[PDB]
Amino acid sequence: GAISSVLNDILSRLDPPEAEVQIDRLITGRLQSLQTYVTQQLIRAAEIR
Amino acid sequence: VFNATRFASVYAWNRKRISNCVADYSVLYNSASFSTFKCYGVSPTKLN
């Protein structure tokens, strides 16, 4: 949902008050990506265990 | 672009192609010669 997928692109383009709105979307998305990855690895770990 | 002789209509605007050059854009924001300077999708000072 952000204006761009590259973090440095938003940092190099938008001001801090405008970049934080778009950077938060990447953080919210990239955080959920790790929460999904870690959730699967934690579950698959129990399977392999 | 800015100091042109005359502008065209709001539907037949004169689209000037700017290519193979360099120029300061942050000074235009702080030139004190324009009414409004607001950039969307990019900061007016960082695009310079």
Side-chain angles (χ1 to χ4, degrees):
Chain A
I3 194 173
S4 181
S5 57
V6 186
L7 176 55
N8 300 334
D9 179 69
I10 291 163
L11 292 167
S12 62
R13 285 170 60 186
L14 296 170
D15 293 318
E18 298 182 1
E20 285 179 2
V21 177
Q22 305 299 324
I23 289 160
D24 180 71
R25 296 177 179 177
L26 295 173
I27 293 162
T28 303
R30 289 182 178 182
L31 183 65
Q32 186 62 48
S33 298
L34 290 165
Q35 288 176 356
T36 304
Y37 172 79
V38 170
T39 296
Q40 291 180 125
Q41 291 291 346
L42 283 164
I43 292 163
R44 293 288 184 186
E47 187 178 1
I48 299 298
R49 282 175 62 177
Chain B
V1 176
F2 302 94
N3 303 324
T5 300
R6 59 179 188 79
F7 282 21
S9 63
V10 300
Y11 58 91
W13 56 84
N14 193 342
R15 180 165 290 182
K16 173 55 176 180
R17 186 180 292 92
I18 298 164
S19 59
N20 301 334
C21 65
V22 304
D24 198 335
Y25 294 87
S26 64
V27 67
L28 303 174
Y29 174 73
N30 296 323
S31 60
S33 59
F34 299 107
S35 181
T36 303
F37 201 109
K38 176 57 174 178
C39 290
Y40 301 89
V42 69
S43 172
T45 64
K46 295 188 174 182
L47 72 91
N48 178 31

Coordinates of all heavy atoms in Angstrom, one line a residue:
Chain A
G1 N 0.8 -1.2 0.0 CA 0.0 0.0 0.0 C 0.8 1.3 0.0 O 0.2 2.4 -0.1
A2 N 2.1 1.2 0.2 CA 3.0 2.4 0.2 C 3.2 2.9 -1.2 O 2.9 2.2 -2.2 CB 4.3 2.1 0.8
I3 N 3.8 4.1 -1.3 CA 4.1 4.7 -2.6 C 5.2 4.0 -3.3 O 5.3 4.0 -4.6 CB 4.4 6.2 -2.4 CG1 4.4 6.9 -3.8 CG2 5.8 6.3 -1.8 CD1 4.6 8.4 -3.7
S4 N 6.1 3.3 -2.6 CA 7.2 2.6 -3.2 C 7.6 1.5 -2.3 O 7.5 1.6 -1.1 CB 8.4 3.5 -3.6 OG 9.4 2.8 -4.2
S5 N 8.2 0.4 -2.9 CA 8.6 -0.8 -2.1 C 10.0 -0.6 -1.6 O 10.4 -1.3 -0.6 CB 8.6 -2.0 -3.0 OG 9.4 -1.9 -4.2
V6 N 10.9 0.3 -2.1 CA 12.2 0.4 -1.7 C 12.2 1.5 -0.6 O 11.7 2.5 -0.7 CB 13.1 0.9 -2.9 CG1 14.6 1.0 -2.4 CG2 13.0 0.0 -4.1
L7 N 12.8 1.1 0.6 CA 12.9 2.0 1.7 C 13.7 3.2 1.4 O 13.3 4.3 1.8 CB 13.5 1.2 2.9 CG 13.7 2.0 4.2 CD1 12.4 2.7 4.7 CD2 14.2 1.1 5.3
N8 N 14.9 3.0 0.8 CA 15.7 4.2 0.5 C 15.1 5.1 -0.5 O 15.4 6.3 -0.5 CB 17.1 3.7 -0.1 CG 17.8 2.8 0.9 OD1 17.6 2.9 2.1 ND2 18.7 2.0 0.4
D9 N 14.2 4.6 -1.4 CA 13.5 5.5 -2.3 C 12.6 6.5 -1.6 O 12.5 7.7 -1.9 CB 12.7 4.6 -3.3 CG 11.9 5.5 -4.3 OD1 12.5 6.1 -5.2 OD2 10.6 5.5 -4.2
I10 N 11.8 6.0 -0.6 CA 11.0 6.9 0.2 C 11.8 7.8 1.0 O 11.5 9.0 1.2 CB 9.9 6.1 1.0 CG1 8.9 5.4 0.1 CG2 9.2 7.0 2.0 CD1 8.2 4.3 0.7
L11 N 12.9 7.3 1.6 CA 13.8 8.2 2.4 C 14.4 9.3 1.6 O 14.6 10.4 2.1 CB 14.8 7.3 3.1 CG 14.4 6.3 4.2 CD1 15.5 5.4 4.5 CD2 13.9 7.1 5.4
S12 N 14.7 9.0 0.3 CA 15.4 9.9 -0.5 C 14.4 10.9 -1.3 O 14.8 11.9 -1.9 CB 16.2 9.2 -1.6 OG 15.4 8.4 -2.4
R13 N 13.1 10.6 -1.2 CA 12.1 11.4 -1.9 C 11.3 12.2 -1.0 O 11.2 13.5 -1.2 CB 11.1 10.4 -2.7 CG 11.7 9.8 -4.0 CD 10.9 8.7 -4.5 NE 9.5 9.2 -4.9 CZ 8.5 8.4 -5.3 NH1 8.6 7.1 -5.4 NH2 7.3 9.0 -5.5
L14 N 10.6 11.7 0.0 CA 9.6 12.4 0.8 C 10.3 13.0 2.1 O 11.3 12.5 2.6 CB 8.5 11.5 1.2 CG 7.6 11.0 0.0 CD1 6.7 9.9 0.5 CD2 6.8 12.1 -0.6
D15 N 9.7 14.0 2.6 CA 10.1 14.6 3.8 C 9.8 13.7 5.0 O 9.1 12.7 4.8 CB 9.3 16.0 4.0 CG 9.7 17.0 3.0 OD1 10.9 17.1 2.7 OD2 8.8 17.7 2.6
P16 N 10.4 13.9 6.2 CA 10.1 13.1 7.3 C 8.6 12.9 7.7 O 8.2 11.8 7.8 CB 10.9 13.7 8.5 CG 12.0 14.5 7.8 CD 11.4 14.9 6.5
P17 N 7.9 14.0 7.8 CA 6.4 13.8 8.1 C 5.7 13.1 7.0 O 4.6 12.5 7.3 CB 5.9 15.2 8.3 CG 6.8 16.1 7.6 CD 8.2 15.4 7.7
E18 N 6.1 13.2 5.8 CA 5.5 12.5 4.7 C 6.0 11.1 4.4 O 5.3 10.2 4.0 CB 5.6 13.3 3.4 CG 4.9 14.6 3.4 CD 5.0 15.4 2.1 OE1 5.6 14.8 1.1 OE2 4.5 16.5 2.0
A19 N 7.3 10.9 4.8 CA 7.9 9.6 4.6 C 7.5 8.6 5.6 O 7.4 7.4 5.4 CB 9.5 9.7 4.5
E20 N 7.3 9.1 6.9 CA 6.9 8.2 8.0 C 5.6 7.6 7.7 O 5.3 6.4 8.2 CB 6.9 9.0 9.3 CG 8.3 9.3 9.9 CD 8.2 10.1 11.1 OE1 7.1 10.4 11.6 OE2 9.3 10.4 11.7
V21 N 4.7 8.2 7.0 CA 3.4 7.7 6.7 C 3.5 6.5 5.7 O 2.9 5.4 5.9 CB 2.4 8.7 6.1 CG1 1.1 8.1 5.7 CG2 2.2 9.9 7.1
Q22 N 4.4 6.6 4.7 CA 4.6 5.5 3.8 C 5.6 4.5 4.3 O 5.4 3.3 4.0 CB 5.2 6.1 2.5 CG 4.3 7.2 1.8 CD 2.9 6.7 1.5 OE1 2.7 5.6 1.1 NE2 1.9 7.6 1.6
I23 N 6.6 4.9 5.1 CA 7.5 4.0 5.7 C 6.8 3.1 6.7 O 7.1 1.9 6.9 CB 8.7 4.7 6.3 CG1 9.6 5.3 5.2 CG2 9.5 3.8 7.2 CD1 10.5 6.4 5.7
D24 N 5.8 3.6 7.4 CA 5.0 2.8 8.4 C 4.3 1.7 7.7 O 4.1 0.6 8.2 CB 4.1 3.7 9.2 CG 3.3 2.9 10.2 OD1 3.8 2.5 11.2 OD2 2.0 2.8 9.9
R25 N 3.8 1.9 6.4 CA 3.2 0.9 5.7 C 4.1 -0.2 5.3 O 3.7 -1.4 5.4 CB 2.5 1.5 4.4 CG 1.4 2.5 4.7 CD 0.9 3.1 3.4 NE -0.1 4.1 3.6 CZ -0.7 4.8 2.7 NH1 -0.4 4.7 1.4 NH2 -1.7 5.6 3.0
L26 N 5.4 0.1 5.0 CA 6.3 -1.0 4.7 C 6.7 -1.7 6.0 O 6.9 -2.9 6.0 CB 7.6 -0.3 4.1 CG 7.5 0.3 2.7 CD1 8.7 1.0 2.3 CD2 7.1 -0.8 1.7
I27 N 6.8 -1.0 7.1 CA 7.1 -1.6 8.4 C 6.0 -2.5 8.8 O 6.2 -3.7 9.3 CB 7.5 -0.6 9.5 CG1 8.8 0.2 9.1 CG2 7.5 -1.2 10.8 CD1 8.9 1.5 9.9
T28 N 4.8 -2.0 8.7 CA 3.6 -2.9 9.1 C 3.5 -4.1 8.2 O 3.1 -5.2 8.6 CB 2.3 -2.0 8.9 OG1 2.4 -0.9 9.8 CG2 1.1 -2.9 9.4
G29 N 3.9 -3.9 6.9 CA 3.8 -5.1 6.0 C 5.0 -6.0 6.2 O 4.8 -7.2 6.3
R30 N 6.2 -5.5 6.2 CA 7.4 -6.3 6.4 C 7.4 -7.0 7.8 O 7.9 -8.1 7.9 CB 8.7 -5.5 6.2 CG 8.9 -5.0 4.8 CD 10.2 -4.3 4.7 NE 10.5 -3.9 3.3 CZ 11.6 -3.2 2.9 NH1 12.5 -2.8 3.7 NH2 11.7 -2.9 1.6
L31 N 6.9 -6.3 8.8 CA 6.7 -7.0 10.1 C 5.8 -8.2 10.0 O 6.1 -9.2 10.6 CB 6.2 -6.0 11.1 CG 6.1 -6.4 12.6 CD1 7.4 -6.8 13.2 CD2 5.4 -5.4 13.4
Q32 N 4.6 -8.0 9.3 CA 3.7 -9.1 9.2 C 4.3 -10.2 8.4 O 4.0 -11.4 8.6 CB 2.4 -8.6 8.5 CG 1.3 -9.6 8.5 CD 0.8 -10.1 9.8 OE1 0.6 -9.3 10.7 NE2 0.7 -11.4 10.0
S33 N 5.2 -9.9 7.4 CA 5.9 -10.9 6.6 C 6.7 -11.8 7.5 O 6.8 -13.0 7.4 CB 6.7 -10.3 5.5 OG 5.9 -9.6 4.6
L34 N 7.5 -11.2 8.5 CA 8.3 -12.0 9.4 C 7.4 -12.7 10.4 O 7.7 -13.9 10.7 CB 9.2 -11.0 10.1 CG 10.4 -10.4 9.3 CD1 11.0 -9.3 10.1 CD2 11.4 -11.5 9.0
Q35 N 6.3 -12.1 10.8 CA 5.4 -12.8 11.7 C 4.8 -14.0 11.1 O 4.5 -15.0 11.7 CB 4.3 -11.8 12.2 CG 4.7 -10.8 13.2 CD 3.7 -9.8 13.5 OE1 2.6 -9.8 13.0 NE2 4.0 -8.9 14.5
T36 N 4.5 -13.9 9.7 CA 4.0 -15.1 9.0 C 5.2 -16.1 8.8 O 4.9 -17.3 9.0 CB 3.5 -14.7 7.7 OG1 2.5 -13.7 7.9 CG2 2.9 -15.9 6.9
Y37 N 6.4 -15.7 8.4 CA 7.5 -16.6 8.3 C 7.9 -17.2 9.6 O 8.1 -18.5 9.6 CB 8.7 -15.8 7.7 CG 10.0 -16.6 7.6 CD1 10.2 -17.5 6.6 CD2 11.0 -16.4 8.5 CE1 11.3 -18.2 6.5 CE2 12.1 -17.1 8.5 CZ 12.3 -18.0 7.5 OH 13.5 -18.8 7.4
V38 N 8.0 -16.5 10.6 CA 8.3 -17.0 11.9 C 7.3 -18.0 12.4 O 7.5 -19.0 13.1 CB 8.7 -15.9 12.9 CG1 8.8 -16.5 14.4 CG2 9.9 -15.2 12.5
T39 N 6.0 -17.6 12.2 CA 4.9 -18.5 12.6 C 5.0 -19.8 11.9 O 4.8 -20.9 12.5 CB 3.5 -17.8 12.3 OG1 3.4 -16.6 13.1 CG2 2.4 -18.7 12.6
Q40 N 5.2 -19.8 10.6 CA 5.4 -21.1 9.8 C 6.6 -21.9 10.3 O 6.5 -23.1 10.5 CB 5.4 -20.8 8.3 CG 4.1 -20.3 7.7 CD 4.2 -20.0 6.3 OE1 3.4 -20.6 5.5 NE2 5.2 -19.2 5.9
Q41 N 7.7 -21.2 10.5 CA 8.9 -21.9 10.9 C 8.8 -22.4 12.3 O 9.2 -23.5 12.6 CB 10.1 -20.9 10.8 CG 10.5 -20.6 9.4 CD 11.2 -21.7 8.7 OE1 11.5 -22.7 9.3 NE2 11.3 -21.6 7.4
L42 N 8.1 -21.7 13.2 CA 7.8 -22.2 14.5 C 6.9 -23.4 14.5 O 7.1 -24.4 15.3 CB 7.2 -21.1 15.4 CG 8.1 -20.0 15.9 CD1 7.3 -18.8 16.4 CD2 9.0 -20.5 17.1
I43 N 6.0 -23.4 13.6 CA 5.0 -24.6 13.5 C 5.7 -25.7 12.8 O 5.7 -26.9 13.2 CB 3.8 -24.1 12.7 CG1 2.9 -23.2 13.6 CG2 2.9 -25.4 12.4 CD1 1.9 -22.4 12.8
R44 N 6.5 -25.4 11.7 CA 7.2 -26.5 11.0 C 8.3 -27.1 11.8 O 8.7 -28.2 11.7 CB 7.8 -25.9 9.7 CG 6.7 -25.6 8.6 CD 6.0 -26.8 8.0 NE 5.1 -26.5 6.9 CZ 4.3 -27.3 6.3 NH1 4.3 -28.6 6.7 NH2 3.5 -26.9 5.4
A45 N 8.9 -26.2 12.7 CA 9.9 -26.7 13.7 C 9.3 -27.8 14.6 O 9.9 -28.9 14.8 CB 10.5 -25.6 14.5
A46 N 8.1 -27.6 15.1 CA 7.4 -28.6 15.9 C 7.2 -29.9 15.1 O 7.3 -31.0 15.6 CB 6.1 -28.1 16.5
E47 N 6.9 -29.7 13.8 CA 6.7 -30.9 12.9 C 8.0 -31.7 12.8 O 8.0 -32.9 12.9 CB 6.1 -30.4 11.6 CG 5.8 -31.6 10.7 CD 5.2 -31.1 9.3 OE1 5.1 -29.9 9.1 OE2 4.8 -31.9 8.5
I48 N 9.1 -31.0 12.5 CA 10.4 -31.6 12.3 C 10.9 -32.2 13.7 O 11.5 -33.2 13.7 CB 11.4 -30.7 11.7 CG1 10.9 -30.2 10.3 CG2 12.8 -31.3 11.6 CD1 10.8 -31.3 9.3
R49 N 10.6 -31.5 14.8 CA 10.9 -32.0 16.1 C 10.1 -33.2 16.4 O 10.7 -34.2 17.1 CB 10.6 -30.9 17.2 CG 11.7 -29.8 17.2 CD 11.3 -28.7 18.2 NE 11.2 -29.2 19.6 CZ 10.9 -28.5 20.6 NH1 10.7 -27.2 20.5 NH2 10.8 -29.0 21.8
Chain B
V1 N 10.1 27.6 -19.3 CA 9.1 26.9 -18.4 C 8.4 27.9 -17.5 O 7.2 28.0 -17.6 CB 9.9 25.8 -17.5 CG1 8.9 25.2 -16.5 CG2 10.5 24.8 -18.4
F2 N 9.1 28.7 -16.7 CA 8.5 29.6 -15.8 C 8.5 31.1 -16.4 O 7.5 31.7 -16.2 CB 9.3 29.7 -14.5 CG 9.3 28.3 -13.8 CD1 10.4 27.5 -13.9 CD2 8.3 27.9 -12.9 CE1 10.5 26.3 -13.3 CE2 8.4 26.7 -12.3 CZ 9.4 25.9 -12.5
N3 N 9.6 31.5 -17.0 CA 9.7 32.8 -17.5 C 9.4 32.9 -19.0 O 10.0 33.7 -19.8 CB 11.1 33.4 -17.3 CG 11.5 33.4 -15.8 OD1 10.6 33.7 -14.9 ND2 12.7 33.2 -15.5
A4 N 8.5 32.0 -19.5 CA 8.1 31.9 -20.9 C 7.4 33.2 -21.3 O 7.0 34.0 -20.5 CB 7.3 30.7 -21.1
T5 N 7.3 33.4 -22.6 CA 6.7 34.5 -23.2 C 5.2 34.5 -22.8 O 4.7 35.5 -22.3 CB 6.8 34.6 -24.7 OG1 8.2 34.7 -25.0 CG2 6.1 35.8 -25.3
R6 N 4.5 33.4 -23.1 CA 3.1 33.3 -22.8 C 2.7 31.9 -22.6 O 3.3 31.0 -23.3 CB 2.2 34.0 -23.8 CG 2.4 33.4 -25.2 CD 1.5 34.1 -26.2 NE 1.5 33.5 -27.5 CZ 0.8 32.4 -27.8 NH1 0.0 31.8 -26.9 NH2 0.9 31.9 -29.1
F7 N 1.8 31.6 -21.7 CA 1.3 30.2 -21.5 C 0.1 29.9 -22.4 O -0.4 30.8 -23.0 CB 0.9 30.0 -20.0 CG 2.0 29.8 -19.1 CD1 3.3 30.2 -19.4 CD2 1.8 29.2 -17.9 CE1 4.4 30.0 -18.5 CE2 2.8 29.0 -17.0 CZ 4.1 29.4 -17.3
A8 N -0.2 28.6 -22.6 CA -1.3 28.2 -23.4 C -2.5 27.9 -22.5 O -2.5 28.2 -21.3 CB -0.8 26.9 -24.2
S9 N -3.6 27.4 -23.2 CA -4.8 27.2 -22.4 C -4.7 26.0 -21.4 O -3.7 25.3 -21.4 CB -5.9 26.8 -23.4 OG -5.7 25.6 -24.1
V10 N -5.7 25.9 -20.6 CA -5.7 24.8 -19.6 C -5.9 23.4 -20.2 O -5.7 22.4 -19.4 CB -6.7 25.1 -18.5 CG1 -6.5 26.4 -17.8 CG2 -8.2 25.1 -19.1
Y11 N -6.3 23.3 -21.4 CA -6.5 22.0 -22.1 C -5.5 21.8 -23.2 O -5.3 20.6 -23.6 CB -7.9 21.9 -22.7 CG -8.3 23.0 -23.6 CD1 -8.1 22.9 -25.0 CD2 -8.9 24.2 -23.2 CE1 -8.4 23.9 -25.9 CE2 -9.2 25.2 -24.1 CZ -9.0 25.1 -25.4 OH -9.3 26.1 -26.3
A12 N -4.9 22.8 -23.8 CA -3.9 22.7 -24.8 C -2.6 23.3 -24.3 O -1.9 24.0 -24.9 CB -4.3 23.5 -26.1
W13 N -2.2 22.9 -23.0 CA -1.0 23.4 -22.4 C 0.2 23.1 -23.2 O 0.3 22.1 -23.9 CB -0.9 22.8 -21.0 CG -0.9 21.3 -20.9 CD1 0.2 20.5 -21.1 CD2 -2.0 20.5 -20.7 NE1 -0.2 19.2 -21.0 CE2 -1.6 19.1 -20.7 CE3 -3.4 20.7 -20.4 CZ2 -2.4 18.0 -20.5 CZ3 -4.2 19.6 -20.2 CH2 -3.7 18.3 -20.3
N14 N 1.3 23.9 -23.0 CA 2.5 23.7 -23.7 C 3.4 22.8 -22.9 O 3.9 23.2 -21.8 CB 3.2 25.0 -24.0 CG 4.4 24.9 -24.9 OD1 4.9 23.9 -25.2 ND2 4.8 26.1 -25.5
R15 N 3.6 21.6 -23.3 CA 4.4 20.6 -22.6 C 5.8 20.7 -23.1 O 6.2 20.2 -24.2 CB 3.8 19.2 -22.8 CG 4.6 18.1 -22.1 CD 3.8 16.8 -22.1 NE 2.7 16.8 -21.2 CZ 1.8 15.8 -20.9 NH1 2.0 14.6 -21.5 NH2 0.8 16.0 -20.1
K16 N 6.7 21.2 -22.2 CA 8.1 21.4 -22.5 C 8.9 20.2 -22.1 O 8.8 19.8 -20.9 CB 8.6 22.7 -21.8 CG 10.1 22.9 -21.9 CD 10.6 22.9 -23.4 CE 12.1 23.2 -23.4 NZ 12.6 23.2 -24.8
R17 N 9.6 19.6 -23.0 CA 10.4 18.4 -22.7 C 11.8 18.8 -22.2 O 12.5 19.5 -23.0 CB 10.5 17.5 -23.9 CG 11.2 16.2 -23.7 CD 11.3 15.3 -24.9 NE 10.0 14.8 -25.4 CZ 9.2 15.4 -26.3 NH1 9.6 16.6 -26.8 NH2 8.1 14.8 -26.6
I18 N 12.1 18.5 -21.0 CA 13.4 18.8 -20.4 C 14.2 17.6 -20.3 O 13.9 16.6 -19.7 CB 13.2 19.4 -18.9 CG1 12.4 20.7 -19.0 CG2 14.5 19.7 -18.3 CD1 11.8 21.2 -17.6
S19 N 15.3 17.6 -21.1 CA 16.2 16.4 -21.2 C 17.6 16.8 -21.4 O 17.9 17.9 -22.1 CB 15.7 15.5 -22.3 OG 15.7 16.2 -23.6
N20 N 18.5 16.0 -20.9 CA 20.0 16.2 -21.1 C 20.4 17.6 -20.5 O 20.9 18.5 -21.3 CB 20.4 16.1 -22.6 CG 20.0 14.7 -23.1 OD1 19.9 13.7 -22.4 ND2 19.8 14.7 -24.4
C21 N 20.2 17.8 -19.2 CA 20.6 19.0 -18.6 C 20.6 18.8 -17.1 O 20.3 17.7 -16.6 CB 19.6 20.1 -19.0 SG 17.9 19.8 -18.4
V22 N 21.0 19.9 -16.4 CA 20.9 19.9 -14.9 C 20.5 21.3 -14.5 O 20.7 22.3 -15.1 CB 22.3 19.5 -14.2 CG1 22.8 18.1 -14.7 CG2 23.3 20.6 -14.5
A23 N 19.8 21.3 -13.3 CA 19.4 22.6 -12.8 C 18.9 22.4 -11.3 O 18.4 21.3 -11.0 CB 18.2 23.2 -13.6
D24 N 19.1 23.4 -10.5 CA 18.7 23.4 -9.1 C 17.2 23.5 -9.0 O 16.6 24.5 -9.4 CB 19.4 24.4 -8.3 CG 19.4 24.2 -6.8 OD1 18.5 23.5 -6.3 OD2 20.4 24.7 -6.1
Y25 N 16.5 22.6 -8.3 CA 15.1 22.6 -8.0 C 14.8 23.1 -6.6 O 13.7 23.6 -6.4 CB 14.5 21.3 -8.3 CG 14.5 20.8 -9.8 CD1 15.6 20.2 -10.3 CD2 13.4 21.1 -10.6 CE1 15.6 19.8 -11.6 CE2 13.4 20.7 -11.9 CZ 14.5 20.1 -12.4 OH 14.5 19.7 -13.7
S26 N 15.7 22.9 -5.7 CA 15.4 23.3 -4.3 C 15.4 24.8 -4.2 O 14.7 25.4 -3.4 CB 16.5 22.8 -3.4 OG 17.8 23.3 -3.7
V27 N 16.2 25.5 -5.0 CA 16.2 27.0 -5.0 C 14.8 27.5 -5.5 O 14.3 28.6 -5.1 CB 17.3 27.5 -5.9 CG1 17.1 27.2 -7.4 CG2 17.5 29.0 -5.7
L28 N 14.1 26.8 -6.4 CA 12.8 27.2 -6.9 C 11.8 27.2 -5.8 O 10.9 28.0 -5.7 CB 12.4 26.3 -8.0 CG 13.3 26.2 -9.2 CD1 12.8 25.1 -10.2 CD2 13.4 27.5 -9.9
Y29 N 11.9 26.2 -4.8 CA 11.0 26.2 -3.7 C 11.3 27.4 -2.8 O 10.3 28.0 -2.3 CB 11.3 24.9 -2.9 CG 10.5 24.8 -1.6 CD1 9.1 24.6 -1.6 CD2 11.2 25.0 -0.4 CE1 8.4 24.5 -0.4 CE2 10.5 24.9 0.8 CZ 9.1 24.7 0.8 OH 8.4 24.6 2.0
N30 N 12.5 27.8 -2.6 CA 12.9 29.0 -1.8 C 13.3 30.2 -2.6 O 14.1 31.0 -2.2 CB 14.0 28.6 -0.8 CG 13.6 27.5 0.2 OD1 12.4 27.5 0.7 ND2 14.5 26.6 0.5
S31 N 12.8 30.2 -3.9 CA 13.2 31.4 -4.7 C 12.5 32.7 -4.3 O 12.9 33.7 -4.7 CB 12.8 31.1 -6.2 OG 11.4 30.8 -6.3
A32 N 11.4 32.6 -3.5 CA 10.6 33.7 -3.1 C 10.0 34.5 -4.3 O 9.8 35.7 -4.2 CB 11.4 34.7 -2.3
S33 N 9.8 33.7 -5.4 CA 9.2 34.3 -6.6 C 8.0 33.5 -7.1 O 7.6 33.7 -8.3 CB 10.2 34.4 -7.7 OG 10.8 33.1 -8.0
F34 N 7.4 32.6 -6.3 CA 6.2 31.8 -6.7 C 5.3 31.9 -5.5 O 5.6 32.0 -4.3 CB 6.6 30.4 -7.0 CG 7.5 30.2 -8.2 CD1 8.8 29.9 -8.0 CD2 7.1 30.5 -9.5 CE1 9.7 29.7 -9.0 CE2 7.9 30.3 -10.5 CZ 9.2 30.0 -10.3
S35 N 4.0 31.7 -5.8 CA 2.9 31.8 -4.8 C 2.9 30.5 -4.0 O 2.9 30.5 -2.8 CB 1.6 32.0 -5.5 OG 0.5 32.1 -4.5
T36 N 2.8 29.3 -4.7 CA 2.7 28.0 -4.1 C 3.7 27.1 -4.8 O 4.0 27.2 -6.0 CB 1.3 27.4 -4.3 OG1 0.3 28.3 -3.8 CG2 1.2 26.0 -3.6
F37 N 4.3 26.2 -3.9 CA 5.3 25.2 -4.4 C 5.1 24.0 -3.5 O 5.6 23.9 -2.4 CB 6.7 25.8 -4.3 CG 7.7 25.0 -5.2 CD1 8.2 25.6 -6.3 CD2 8.1 23.7 -4.9 CE1 9.1 25.0 -7.1 CE2 9.0 23.0 -5.7 CZ 9.5 23.7 -6.8
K38 N 4.3 23.0 -4.0 CA 4.0 21.8 -3.3 C 4.2 20.6 -4.2 O 3.5 20.6 -5.3 CB 2.5 21.9 -2.8 CG 2.0 20.6 -2.1 CD 2.9 20.2 -0.9 CE 2.3 19.0 -0.2 NZ 3.1 18.6 1.0
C39 N 5.0 19.7 -3.8 CA 5.3 18.5 -4.6 C 4.7 17.3 -4.0 O 4.7 17.1 -2.8 CB 6.9 18.3 -4.7 SG 7.8 19.5 -5.7
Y40 N 4.0 16.5 -4.9 CA 3.3 15.3 -4.5 C 4.2 14.1 -4.9 O 4.7 14.0 -6.0 CB 1.9 15.3 -5.2 CG 1.1 16.4 -4.8 CD1 1.1 17.6 -5.6 CD2 0.2 16.4 -3.7 CE1 0.3 18.7 -5.3 CE2 -0.6 17.5 -3.4 CZ -0.6 18.6 -4.2 OH -1.4 19.7 -3.9
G41 N 4.3 13.1 -4.0 CA 5.1 12.0 -4.2 C 6.6 12.2 -4.0 O 7.4 11.2 -4.2
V42 N 7.0 13.4 -3.8 CA 8.4 13.7 -3.6 C 8.5 15.1 -2.9 O 7.7 16.0 -3.1 CB 9.2 13.7 -4.9 CG1 8.8 14.9 -5.8 CG2 10.7 13.7 -4.6
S43 N 9.5 15.2 -2.0 CA 9.8 16.5 -1.4 C 10.3 17.5 -2.3 O 11.1 17.2 -3.2 CB 10.7 16.3 -0.2 OG 11.1 17.6 0.4
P44 N 10.0 18.8 -2.2 CA 10.5 19.8 -3.2 C 12.0 20.0 -3.0 O 12.6 20.5 -4.0 CB 9.7 21.1 -2.9 CG 9.3 20.9 -1.5 CD 9.1 19.5 -1.2
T45 N 12.6 19.7 -1.9 CA 14.0 19.9 -1.6 C 14.9 18.7 -1.9 O 16.0 18.8 -2.3 CB 14.3 20.3 -0.2 OG1 13.9 19.3 0.7 CG2 13.5 21.6 0.2
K46 N 14.3 17.5 -1.8 CA 15.0 16.3 -2.0 C 15.1 15.9 -3.4 O 16.1 15.2 -3.8 CB 14.4 15.1 -1.2 CG 14.5 15.3 0.3 CD 14.0 14.1 1.1 CE 14.2 14.2 2.6 NZ 13.8 12.9 3.3
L47 N 14.2 16.3 -4.3 CA 14.2 15.9 -5.7 C 15.4 16.7 -6.4 O 15.8 16.2 -7.5 CB 12.9 16.3 -6.4 CG 12.5 17.8 -6.6 CD1 13.0 18.3 -8.0 CD2 11.0 17.9 -6.5
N48 N 15.9 17.8 -5.8 CA 17.1 18.4 -6.4 C 18.3 17.5 -6.4 O 19.1 17.6 -7.3 CB 17.4 19.7 -5.6 CG 18.6 20.4 -6.2 OD1 18.9 20.4 -7.4 ND2 19.3 21.1 -5.3

